[PDB]
Amino acid sequence: QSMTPTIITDVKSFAIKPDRHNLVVVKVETNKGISGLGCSTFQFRPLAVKTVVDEYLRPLLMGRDANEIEDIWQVMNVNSYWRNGPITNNAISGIDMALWDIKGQLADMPLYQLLGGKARTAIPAYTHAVADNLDDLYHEIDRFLAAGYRYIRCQLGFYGGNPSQLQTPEEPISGSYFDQTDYMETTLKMFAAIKEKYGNQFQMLHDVHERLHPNQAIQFAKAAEPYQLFFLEDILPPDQSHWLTQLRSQSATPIATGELFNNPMEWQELVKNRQIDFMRAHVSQIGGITPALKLAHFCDAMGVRIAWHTPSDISPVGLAVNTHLNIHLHNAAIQETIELPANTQSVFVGSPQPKGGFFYPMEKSGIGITFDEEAAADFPVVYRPHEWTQSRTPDGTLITP
């Protein structure tokens, strides 16, 4: 034959914290001595993801033929009967990505080539500029412009912190407090100042990060329209996305959403009805490369573009996968980038980095990342309280974070 079964002989998970974020990576070993890596990084619940991989997915997968990625994905997806969700899908993602890594290595092709080759020369990147005053923000923007970036996510002010820092009722419920009206006003002030100073030199992005009640979100998105953002992101929480119908009939601000999605019913109608311009799914949250390709193709049919969520809390394996998908998929639009720290580079070898404001194709076979098991051992998970997920308006209402 030209191809024999590739038998899974081990499944391992590694929950580690080299730098600021808890990561989870999965390694699948085979009888051929070809191993694959995958990203299962859900930084807030890494121990729970590890439990799923070690106690449930490993015994399910042992002995199976890794060549059949599609069937294995389908099996994993429904294996616990109840399905979808952030812990469930991250565990599945690590396996699915590792199987694609293995297939690329067997083919001796980088992942983007195995998938059908490139759709572009390189994918544009965007960086993040955030400061509590305009002067410091301009300095960040200036640096990125000199580095070749033509797309920059911009935020003025910080929106969290002790209730002592703003007007609240007495004895406020503990949490991370901000004022929605101050957030909107300050951000519009920022848009106007950046536009006046930089004009067409680059395109702003901005992430509303579900800070607003529905009508506030609609008003804010309308107000963003004159500033010609590349996109305005997450103006509504996932379960109130239908409110976009009112916005879309009166505004042409470009809309991105989806980093929070982990269930197809969150996006099915949005995509079918062209209610968003950019799908921002986090690949591991939707269950890996297998479902990501299908989603990208569904979006493409509707003219919806892709901008996978690629935050600081992603492993270099997940970063590499997004790079391959972005080079291959015709409807990929942009690649979110945050600089990788030194400890992380010590554990993961081969991570892509932007060059002159673009990410170029990665050429090693498979995903292209090597994992140093021994170095990883020095960086166990460390518990974080992440108080920003207890976000409150001044009256003490717990809002979507």
Q: Which does 47 bind (CB under 5 to 8 A by kind): its own copies, Mg ion, Cl ion, none?
A: its own copies
Specify whether 159 is catalytic: yes
Which residues from 178-217 bind its own copies, rule CB under 8 A?
181, 185, 200, 203, 213-215
189 binds, among Mg ion, its own copies, Cl ion, none (CB under 5 to 8 A by kind): none
What does 82 interact with, of Mg ion, its own copies, Cl ion, none (CB < 5 to 8 A by kind)? its own copies
Residue tagged active-site, from 159, 177, 183, 227:
159
- Relative to beta strand 123-131, strand 358-359 is antiparallel
- Pick out the residues of the known binding site for Mg(2+): 207, 233, 259
- Per CB under 8 A, which of residues 44..63 are in contact with its own copies? 44-45, 47-48, 51-52, 55-56, 59
**Within 10 A of 197 (CB to CB), how many other CB atoms are there?**
13
Q: Does 290 bind its own copies (CB under 8 A)?
A: yes
Q: Which residues contact 103 (CB under 8 A, 6 or more apart)?
A: 66, 67, 69, 114, 366
Binding mask 181-210 for Cl ion (x = CB under 5 A): -------------------------xx---
> According to CB under 5 A, which one of 88, 253, 351, 365 is a site residue for Cl ion?
88
Token pair for 58:
């490993």
**Residue 209 a catalytic site member:** yes
In whole angstroms, what is the distance from residue 20 CA to residue 27 CA? 22
DSSP-based three-state secondary structure for 77: helix
Torsion of CA 244, 292, 286, 319, to 10 degrees: -110
Nearer to Mg ion, 29 or 259 (CB): 259
User: Which one of 140-148, 253-261, 363-371, 385-393 is the stretch in contact with Mg ion (CB under 5 A)?
Assistant: 253-261
For Mg ion, the binding residues in 192-231 under the rule CB under 5 A are 207
Which of the listed partners (Mg ion, Cl ion, its own copies, none) does 128 bind, with a CB threshold of 5 to 8 Å by partner kind?
none
Q: Are 221 and 251 in contact (CB under 8 A)?
A: yes
Q: Which residues are 7's β-sheet partners?
A: 65
Find out whether 296 and 307 touch, Cβ atoms under 8 Å. Answer: no
Q: What does the alpha-carbon distance between residue 302 and residue 299 come to, in Å, rounded to a whole number? A: 5
In the numeric block, the tokens 């390709």 are attached to 293
Residue closer to Mg ion (CB basis): 69 or 212: 212
Separation between Cα atoms, residue 190 and residue 182, nearest integer Å: 12
* 343 vs 396, beta carbon nearer its own copies: 396
Choosing from 328, 337, 369, 371, the residue that interacts with its own copies (CB under 8 A) is: 328
Whether 325 and 308 have beta carbons less than 8 Å apart is answered as: yes
Catalytic residues, which ones? Answer: 159, 209
